[PDB]
Amino acid sequence: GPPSGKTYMGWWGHMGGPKQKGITSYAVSPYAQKPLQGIFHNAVFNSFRRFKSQFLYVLIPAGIYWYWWKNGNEYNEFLYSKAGREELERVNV
Amino acid sequence: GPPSGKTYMGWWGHMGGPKQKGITSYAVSPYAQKPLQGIFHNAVFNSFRRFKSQFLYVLIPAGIYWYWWKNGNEYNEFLYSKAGREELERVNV
Amino acid sequence: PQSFTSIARIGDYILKSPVLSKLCVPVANQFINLAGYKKLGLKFDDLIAEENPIMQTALRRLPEDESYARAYRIIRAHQTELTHHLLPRNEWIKAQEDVPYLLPYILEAEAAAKEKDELDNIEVSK
Amino acid sequence: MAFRKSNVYLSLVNSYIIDSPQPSSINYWWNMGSLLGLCLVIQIVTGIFMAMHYSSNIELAFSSVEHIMRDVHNGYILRYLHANGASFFFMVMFMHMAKGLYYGSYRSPRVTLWNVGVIIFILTIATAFLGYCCVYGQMSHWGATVITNLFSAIPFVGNDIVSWLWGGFSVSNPTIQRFFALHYLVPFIIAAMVIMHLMALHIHGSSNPLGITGNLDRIPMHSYFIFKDLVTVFLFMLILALFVFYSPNTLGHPDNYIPGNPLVTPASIVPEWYLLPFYAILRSIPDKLLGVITMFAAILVLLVLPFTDRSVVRGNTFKVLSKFFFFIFVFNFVLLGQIGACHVEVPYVLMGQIATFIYFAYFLIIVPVISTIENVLFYIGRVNK
Amino acid sequence: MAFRKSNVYLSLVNSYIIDSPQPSSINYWWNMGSLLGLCLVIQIVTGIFMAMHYSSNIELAFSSVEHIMRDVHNGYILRYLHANGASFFFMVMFMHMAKGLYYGSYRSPRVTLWNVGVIIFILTIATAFLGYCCVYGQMSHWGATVITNLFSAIPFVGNDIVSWLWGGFSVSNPTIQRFFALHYLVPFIIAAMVIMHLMALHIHGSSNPLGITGNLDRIPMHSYFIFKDLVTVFLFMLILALFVFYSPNTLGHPDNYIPGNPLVTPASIVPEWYLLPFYAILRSIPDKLLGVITMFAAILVLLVLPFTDRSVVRGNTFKVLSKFFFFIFVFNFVLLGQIGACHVEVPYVLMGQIATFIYFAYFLIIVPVISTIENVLFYIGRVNK
Amino acid sequence: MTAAEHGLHAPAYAWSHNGPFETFDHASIRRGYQVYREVCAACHSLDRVAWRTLVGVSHTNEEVRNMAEEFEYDDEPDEQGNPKKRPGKLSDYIPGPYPNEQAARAANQGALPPDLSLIVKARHGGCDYIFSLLTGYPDEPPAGVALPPGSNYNPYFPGGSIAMARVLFDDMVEYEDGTPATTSQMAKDVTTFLNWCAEPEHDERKRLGLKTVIILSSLYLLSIWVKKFKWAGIKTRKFVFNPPKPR
Amino acid sequence: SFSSLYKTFFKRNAVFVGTIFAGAFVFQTVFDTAITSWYENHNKGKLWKDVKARIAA
Ligand code: HEC
Ligand code: HEM
Ligand code: HEM
Ligand code: HEM
Ligand code: HEM
């Protein structure tokens, strides 16, 4: 068939990475391993490390936007009440 | 990408035919030619050559099945007429 | 799909017999004349479907002058049938020119493949 | 390299349409596949633009088709385009299968291509049947009744399969709504199978009328076969335009404009004309189970073809007896359709039985014997001994 | 070679599923694409099995959906599966798009992948809209009325486009049958676009959460990511089974069980929840033409993101300010949806306009400036001069 | 089957709309509507033809509004929910004489009269079959035909025994334009009218067919020329073969 | 002046396809009018305008 363009990924044998030397990999058979090893240690400790690392980025925008939505909702419930109809007609007209 | 199986067609450059030496092609530009050259000669002469060589294979079996169909149609029309009701009940029962 | 050893076996039995030769060879000559591949500049050993390993082996082992001649006859037949014409009667393949050139290579590669199969499926008498 | 080569999608378009090496010597019978692609595009577009207005209830099916003919602007154009284009879809498909049968395009490299085409033929037969039943005329109801009462011949689970297909106890509003839903669904399965047909054709290329290798003289498909296909595309549009505008109800049966009535039998329950040969193969066997087995075996006997063709050269281009028996087969198929159009009467029973025997003896008996005879005659005509 | 590599079709299944080299370090956010394929198979299958019973007339749309919910065996299973699976389709689609926005999967190799993804997003939004209008409840009719009366703001041919979409003079019988034909058709365009998505993915491979090159350490997709995706497939099925069998009408508006009445306004016209941010970006602009132009720009501003992401490392894995503003964008999207669910009242109008401005300033203003500042900080934190 | 069970095949009359450039005689459609309203509408329905489609074919707008007002249809119920009738408009359909099939079968000896909206297309033969059925009533059936009571003989009906009595007699309809209404003239008029009710797109369809056939024939001939032009450089190739030197 | 003819109309492909669309517009209008006039003139006396003029006289 025809050849296609220059891609940044080959297949098994010519992936197009750097030449690798000196990097030696060791693995064991899963049949000779314990799966579910360390899950009670990682569940209470490594999960706590990941939560300590990445909760300000997810929680400070959540705090800002939830406080904004709650304040806007409380201002709407003040506006369509009986005590704030003067301010309602002022800010609507 | 991954390679596919051994096919009997390559592409432009590596088709998979044999090596060719000595066969020389000549082709002049169509912008220097006459399209519709020879259409009246080949309309009545080449067409008769092709029809004469290839009409017995198409006209003997067509005639066989058309004669069979016409004979069966005439026999059916004779059977469900008034002249052939005795033969109708005989070949029906 | 039919093996060329089988065709050669049946054909050699028909040709060696004196009754069957005189009965069936003129019918075969008329069949080949009516088939009309020689009217396009082709021998029969070009007509064989080359898309199998036996035929690819035979076309690989075919020598170079026969290969270039066969290639020219195939391209000539393609140009002729493109033009919807025939070859001129001076350029038709003569009957003495329609010689089986690919048949010994086909039969040799076929005998090699049948021997390979029979040796892959032996049962040693023990 | 060029942008039609280096792109992701334009490389597919390029290697299938633009740069695709076609042989130089293929003739106008090789335009039938492109014509089938055009036919399928026509059917899908017109069918969507009529499914915008069609109502698939049993009380609204025929009247909604009659609303398409009457109230929809250019709706008769869409309806006649759909009906006559399905008839032309089967005309061109019979020419495509007969070209594969003549030139031997089923053989040793292209066997998977042949089997995918047979799958497409099954799916197109089924789509034509379901869409014919979608009209709910008199022929739709009784054709659906016969061909779905066929499945009550299976000994164990026959009535279960039948009442599951019907959705009830006869052809009714559940069956018509199943048939519209499946008639919408199935042409996209056909389009997927057409893409797989194109893959299996693309790995090995087209054959040529000679049967010899096309690898030597080859021509790009763009600017040569684009226009060689455009000629037959415009011819197909011309004949379809004649059959859509001037004689629009020729190929249809005139009973379909009767509203669908289950209590009135129209005295000749006949399917569309492109199902009449398999209907005659059905009716030739005097058994309900063996008849539907014989009809499905008539469609699936195309798969015995690359194994029974004992010929050593490809295609009947240079074979006298294969030419003669191929055309005996073609006009036997015509006679079988003409038998299936007719009533079950005295010469027609034996005529359809002998023609069904010829239809099956071509693939199993005629082709190996004739091709072996031609191998032996081709040998002894030029071997001197 | 193996038969999984040498075959025509099994080489495709092999090179996409079985031997597809994924990087070793990708996480469970890379399971959402396979989950979207599962959602599409769920939607198409339950859609066909309800189209066998649904009737698209304006008198029989709601009655036929209730026929599915009452008379059809397990038809409540199919209807709740279709509806809540569409909600889950859009949940997993927002997760797929957000992980693409986060890990930089839109950059220089995969711009074609990102753009085909945006086309799939547009087509899936359109499919969900037409299928919601197929029920013909109260929110269906009035959602159809509002969103198709949006196109009467185009000053040249707005009334022509509106009366062509409606098929008449309001949303009616031809509108609902149009929408049903289109809702059947467009998911097969989504399936073809998913195959184009897989082509654009396959030519360059997946990204990894580090952003660095993945050519060094790779793993074949079978036996590792097959079961790694099976985990999330069973988790998705578990959450969908909870929402189908125990809380089936939580994600639905309760006004859709009122039949479609053109003479009664239901006092809050609101589409399905996954179109609510785009409904808010619509209602923020106080003009009908600029509002629908801003909604189409809200869908089409993701095409600007490959050329505004000025970073030199890919993905916000190692970027502090980009991480903070990415989750500000995410919770701005949630605020935009909750704003569009609300009525048009005094704090909500200003909050919706501000949230729309933050939505458009993320791609156009915030991302180039923050990525340039992070480029400068990454340089000067380790260059000593 | 027998020839009596097939029916007599109707011959090929020279209609004014047979032929690829022809149109319905629209005055014949007008006279056919007159013979429908005065004869055929007593037993036959026209449930697919709206009044508004008659405008511009056989009558004028104010001419069809009077007929539509002459019939009555069901209105939306009044403020008290009672059923209400209404004089018709253009948008309504032509009403049949019987309220249901059982009323029709009560009035016509148990044989349901079919709805004549599609019956030119619904029967093999078409306008020829309708004309030959309407006129081909023999005064005496052929000797030996066991005829049931209440069934007349017509050789064009399949089976011979039709339950429609002969309803076309000479000068039963006083035509508006003074056309001499014989039985065959009235049959020609209702057959043209029923063919219009079957295919009301007939004139425009043949018009568009002429446009389409001219454009596609011109495109086919131009595409043949363009094919031969693009293919000339390949079609006139020449191969020579000087065999190479041995190595 | 075939050189001038080629250099004007067929050298630039933009002017070529523009002349194609301009000719297609003029062709659609004129040819539709010609087929309508030929059809209505071939069928004289059978159209509703002629039946209406007969009713008017
Ligand atoms: C009074 C009662 C009438 C009148 C005034 C007409 N018709 Fe006819 N018609 C009638 C009956 C009971 C039947 C059923 C016959 C049967 O099935 O045995 C019919 C049938 C027809 C048919 C169908 C013929 C067929 O099925 O092959 C046609 C085409 C038909 N009628 C036409 C027709 C026309 C054109 C009339 C007046 C101008 C007309 N009928 C009058 C009962 C009655
Ligand atoms: C594979 C291609 C198709 C074939 C062969 C096919 C075949 C048919 C046929 C033979 C009929 C009956 C025509 C008649 O006698 O009136 C029909 C009807 C119909 N088809 Fe299809 N069809 C195809 C594609 C489609 C698709 C994809 C749709 C749906 C979008 C569709 C919608 C219809 C509809 C609505 C009818 C209703 C009756 C009518 O108006 O013709 N068709 N089809
Ligand atoms: C929707 C229906 C189909 C479409 C779109 C289709 C499409 C195509 C196309 C485009 C080609 C290439 C052009 C050609 O060779 O004619 C082709 C080739 C082929 N098709 Fe089909 N096809 C269809 C149905 C079938 C059927 C029903 C069969 C027979 C079982 C079949 C068998 C073949 C074969 C054998 C070839 C190769 C012929 C050759 O080049 O030697 N196809 N098909
Ligand atoms: C792209 C995937 C699809 C999506 C996102 C989708 C979305 C939807 C949605 C949201 C509804 C309204 C559900 C409700 O609230 O009751 C719906 C209804 C419907 N959809 Fe789909 N749909 C999809 C695929 C399909 C397909 C392919 C079909 C047809 C074969 C289909 C047939 C239906 C039908 C009949 C309804 C009618 C009401 C019902 O029974 O739920 N859907 N669709
Ligand atoms: C029917 C909908 C879709 C399906 C089935 C689908 C399928 C897939 C699959 C299977 C992958 C590879 C696995 C993965 O990386 O997660 C993928 C990757 C991707 N998809 Fe989608 N996708 C869909 C919609 C979208 C949408 C809406 C977008 C966003 C515009 C998108 C953008 C991407 C991107 C950027 C990648 C590459 C992710 C990476 O490798 O880092 N897709 N898609």
mmCIF file of C-alpha atoms in Angstrom, chain C:
data_model
loop_
_atom_site.group_PDB
_atom_site.id
_atom_site.type_symbol
_atom_site.label_atom_id
_atom_site.label_comp_id
_atom_site.label_asym_id
_atom_site.label_seq_id
_atom_site.Cartn_x
_atom_site.Cartn_y
_atom_site.Cartn_z
ATOM 1 C CA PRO C 1 -7.543 -25.646 -7.809
ATOM 2 C CA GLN C 2 -7.087 -28.805 -9.886
ATOM 3 C CA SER C 3 -3.497 -29.972 -9.666
ATOM 4 C CA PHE C 4 -1.388 -29.869 -12.808
ATOM 5 C CA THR C 5 -0.137 -33.375 -12.017
ATOM 6 C CA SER C 6 -3.741 -34.542 -12.346
ATOM 7 C CA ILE C 7 -4.170 -32.727 -15.663
ATOM 8 C CA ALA C 8 -0.896 -34.191 -16.923
ATOM 9 C CA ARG C 9 -1.917 -37.683 -15.772
ATOM 10 C CA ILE C 10 -5.298 -37.559 -17.537
ATOM 11 C CA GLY C 11 -3.792 -35.879 -20.589
ATOM 12 C CA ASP C 12 -0.960 -38.378 -20.914
ATOM 13 C CA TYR C 13 -3.426 -41.256 -20.634
ATOM 14 C CA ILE C 14 -5.533 -39.662 -23.374
ATOM 15 C CA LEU C 15 -2.545 -38.916 -25.617
ATOM 16 C CA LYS C 16 -0.838 -42.305 -25.261
ATOM 17 C CA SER C 17 -4.032 -44.199 -26.134
ATOM 18 C CA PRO C 18 -4.547 -44.538 -29.912
ATOM 19 C CA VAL C 19 -8.351 -44.438 -29.848
ATOM 20 C CA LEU C 20 -8.703 -41.597 -27.348
ATOM 21 C CA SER C 21 -6.094 -39.448 -29.123
ATOM 22 C CA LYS C 22 -7.804 -39.718 -32.525
ATOM 23 C CA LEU C 23 -11.162 -39.138 -30.818
ATOM 24 C CA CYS C 24 -10.443 -36.215 -28.460
ATOM 25 C CA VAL C 25 -7.416 -34.289 -29.805
ATOM 26 C CA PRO C 26 -9.241 -32.658 -32.796
ATOM 27 C CA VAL C 27 -12.047 -31.588 -30.443
ATOM 28 C CA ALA C 28 -9.389 -30.012 -28.221
ATOM 29 C CA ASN C 29 -7.774 -28.232 -31.172
ATOM 30 C CA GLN C 30 -11.170 -26.826 -32.125
ATOM 31 C CA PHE C 31 -11.780 -25.863 -28.486
ATOM 32 C CA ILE C 32 -8.479 -23.970 -28.367
ATOM 33 C CA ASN C 33 -9.202 -22.254 -31.692
ATOM 34 C CA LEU C 34 -12.648 -21.210 -30.458
ATOM 35 C CA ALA C 35 -11.254 -20.059 -27.103
ATOM 36 C CA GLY C 36 -9.279 -17.434 -28.974
ATOM 37 C CA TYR C 37 -6.576 -16.455 -26.518
ATOM 38 C CA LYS C 38 -4.103 -16.649 -29.395
ATOM 39 C CA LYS C 39 -6.065 -13.830 -31.081
ATOM 40 C CA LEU C 40 -4.738 -11.493 -28.360
ATOM 41 C CA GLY C 41 -1.120 -12.622 -28.601
ATOM 42 C CA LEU C 42 -1.142 -15.057 -25.681
ATOM 43 C CA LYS C 43 0.078 -18.563 -25.069
ATOM 44 C CA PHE C 44 -1.873 -20.690 -22.625
ATOM 45 C CA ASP C 45 0.852 -20.712 -19.985
ATOM 46 C CA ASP C 46 0.219 -16.987 -19.506
ATOM 47 C CA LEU C 47 -3.490 -17.641 -18.908
ATOM 48 C CA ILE C 48 -2.888 -19.688 -15.728
ATOM 49 C CA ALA C 49 -3.866 -17.858 -12.538
ATOM 50 C CA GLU C 50 -0.519 -16.965 -10.975
ATOM 51 C CA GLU C 51 -1.876 -16.231 -7.485
ATOM 52 C CA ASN C 52 -0.773 -19.358 -5.658
ATOM 53 C CA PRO C 53 2.601 -20.440 -4.207
ATOM 54 C CA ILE C 54 3.063 -23.175 -6.826
ATOM 55 C CA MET C 55 2.605 -20.704 -9.673
ATOM 56 C CA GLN C 56 4.687 -18.056 -7.903
ATOM 57 C CA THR C 57 7.456 -20.621 -7.473
ATOM 58 C CA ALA C 58 7.208 -21.519 -11.168
ATOM 59 C CA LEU C 59 7.350 -17.874 -12.245
ATOM 60 C CA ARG C 60 10.344 -17.323 -9.993
ATOM 61 C CA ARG C 61 12.213 -20.308 -11.441
ATOM 62 C CA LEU C 62 11.297 -19.330 -15.016
ATOM 63 C CA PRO C 63 14.390 -17.971 -16.830
ATOM 64 C CA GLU C 64 14.711 -14.357 -17.827
ATOM 65 C CA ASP C 65 14.052 -14.390 -21.572
ATOM 66 C CA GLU C 66 10.847 -16.397 -21.141
ATOM 67 C CA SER C 67 9.891 -13.989 -18.350
ATOM 68 C CA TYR C 68 10.309 -10.847 -20.453
ATOM 69 C CA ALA C 69 8.504 -12.472 -23.393
ATOM 70 C CA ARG C 70 5.604 -13.506 -21.140
ATOM 71 C CA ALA C 71 5.487 -10.007 -19.653
ATOM 72 C CA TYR C 72 5.299 -8.478 -23.133
ATOM 73 C CA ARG C 73 2.508 -10.826 -24.163
ATOM 74 C CA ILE C 74 0.531 -9.938 -21.028
ATOM 75 C CA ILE C 75 0.902 -6.174 -21.507
ATOM 76 C CA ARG C 76 0.098 -6.582 -25.213
ATOM 77 C CA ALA C 77 -3.083 -8.500 -24.378
ATOM 78 C CA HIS C 78 -4.076 -5.801 -21.886
ATOM 79 C CA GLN C 79 -3.599 -3.041 -24.463
ATOM 80 C CA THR C 80 -5.435 -5.055 -27.132
ATOM 81 C CA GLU C 81 -8.424 -5.823 -24.904
ATOM 82 C CA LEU C 82 -8.369 -2.192 -23.792
ATOM 83 C CA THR C 83 -8.858 -1.145 -27.414
ATOM 84 C CA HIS C 84 -11.633 -3.799 -27.777
ATOM 85 C CA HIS C 85 -9.865 -5.151 -30.852
ATOM 86 C CA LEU C 86 -7.930 -8.241 -31.834
ATOM 87 C CA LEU C 87 -4.372 -8.592 -32.869
ATOM 88 C CA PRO C 88 -3.671 -8.518 -36.623
ATOM 89 C CA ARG C 89 -3.588 -11.986 -38.145
ATOM 90 C CA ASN C 90 0.139 -11.728 -38.855
ATOM 91 C CA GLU C 91 0.727 -11.136 -35.126
ATOM 92 C CA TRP C 92 -1.446 -13.960 -33.787
ATOM 93 C CA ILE C 93 0.163 -16.785 -31.845
ATOM 94 C CA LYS C 94 0.746 -19.712 -34.180
ATOM 95 C CA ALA C 95 -0.100 -23.255 -33.142
ATOM 96 C CA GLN C 96 3.569 -24.269 -33.269
ATOM 97 C CA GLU C 97 4.359 -21.238 -31.099
ATOM 98 C CA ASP C 98 1.928 -22.239 -28.330
ATOM 99 C CA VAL C 99 4.377 -24.513 -26.538
ATOM 100 C CA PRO C 100 4.112 -25.236 -22.808
ATOM 101 C CA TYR C 101 7.140 -23.449 -21.376
ATOM 102 C CA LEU C 102 5.870 -23.051 -17.812
ATOM 103 C CA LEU C 103 4.519 -26.600 -17.512
ATOM 104 C CA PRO C 104 7.787 -28.351 -16.418
ATOM 105 C CA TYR C 105 8.421 -25.716 -13.758
ATOM 106 C CA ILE C 106 4.812 -26.023 -12.562
ATOM 107 C CA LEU C 107 5.025 -29.823 -12.412
ATOM 108 C CA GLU C 108 8.410 -29.749 -10.659
ATOM 109 C CA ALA C 109 7.258 -27.309 -7.963
ATOM 110 C CA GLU C 110 4.059 -29.355 -7.648
ATOM 111 C CA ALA C 111 5.982 -32.593 -7.096
ATOM 112 C CA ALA C 112 8.105 -30.779 -4.519
ATOM 113 C CA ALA C 113 5.007 -29.563 -2.657
ATOM 114 C CA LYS C 114 3.355 -32.991 -2.736
ATOM 115 C CA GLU C 115 6.556 -34.585 -1.415
ATOM 116 C CA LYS C 116 6.692 -31.950 1.325
ATOM 117 C CA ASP C 117 3.097 -32.740 2.296
ATOM 118 C CA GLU C 118 3.663 -36.514 2.246
ATOM 119 C CA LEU C 119 6.740 -36.122 4.446
ATOM 120 C CA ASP C 120 4.864 -33.858 6.851
ATOM 121 C CA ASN C 121 2.190 -36.542 7.215
ATOM 122 C CA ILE C 122 4.257 -39.756 7.392
ATOM 123 C CA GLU C 123 3.716 -42.598 9.848
ATOM 124 C CA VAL C 124 6.929 -44.502 10.542
ATOM 125 C CA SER C 125 6.188 -48.239 10.581
ATOM 126 C CA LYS C 126 6.768 -48.991 14.261
#
